[PDB]
Amino acid sequence: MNPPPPETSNPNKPKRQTNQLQYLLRVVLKTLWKHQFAWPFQQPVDAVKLNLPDYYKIIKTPMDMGTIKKRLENNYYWNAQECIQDFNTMFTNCYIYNKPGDDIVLMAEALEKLFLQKINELPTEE
Ligand SMILES: Cn1c(=O)n(C)c2cc(C(N)=O)ccc21
């Protein structure tokens, strides 16, 4: 069994649409999403189909770019830090679960390098 996915909709949660969050969608998410190594990270890990029965025993804070994309498109966030944390959670999960050197780790590292370069130029708030 897979767990329920992370929340992407919560009408109780206060929301903003801001230039930093717009950057996170238009520059950061879109840059990583189109990458040749994006595909393992475009949706929640399906531990059943991938035969990783211990994945959610080890990973208790799942995150993926499919979830982040939905959160950004549906204006789920209050600030950029929340979204940046989601990306970092996704990368960290990969490094925590997988054997050092594995293809998936190299893929995460390539995406993380781009992520860091884009976040380095996060625009100042308007
Ligand atoms: C070990 N592992 C991970 O840690 N992630 C994120 C994975 C994604 C896929 C996949 N086929 O999407 C397959 C295996 C994966």
Give residue limits of the domains in the chain.
Answer: 18-122
Angle at 63 between CA 44 and CA 17, to 5 degrees: 110
97 lines ligand 1 (CB under 6 A): yes
Confirm if 7 and 49 have CB atoms less than 8 A apart. no
Confirm if 6 and 66 have CB atoms less than 8 A apart. no
- 40 alpha carbon – ligand 1 mean position (Å): 5
Pick the atom of ligand 1 nearest to 39's CA: 12
Distance CA 119, CA 122 (A): 5
| Orientation of helix 80-97 relative to helix 65-73, angle to 10° | 170
* Cα dihedral across residues 88, 78, 29, 126: positive or negative: negative
Confirm if 77 and 22 have CB atoms less than 8 A apart. no
Which element (helix H / strand E) includes 115?
A: helix 103-119
CATH 2.60.40.10 fits 18-122, yes or no: no
Approach to solving: X-ray
Distance CA 123, CA 126 (A): 9
> Resolution of the coordinates in A?
1.4
Pick the atom of ligand 1 nearest to 102's CA: 1
Hunting for tokens 């930093």 — which residue is that?
A: 20
**Cα–Cα nearest to 35, from 98, 113, 87, 89:** 113
Q: How many CB atoms lie within 10 A of CB 58?
A: 10
Q: Is 36 helix (H, G, I), strand (E, B) or coil?
A: coil
Q: Is 108 helix (H, G, I), strand (E, B) or coil?
A: helix
Q: What is the DSSP string of 37-104?
A: T-GGGSS---TTTTT-TTHHHH-SS---HHHHHHHHHTT--SSHHHHHHHHHHHHHHHHHHSPTT-HH
45 lines ligand 1 (CB under 6 A): yes
Minimum CA distance residue for ligand 1 atom 1: 98
Hunting for tokens 């208790």 — which residue is that?
A: 60
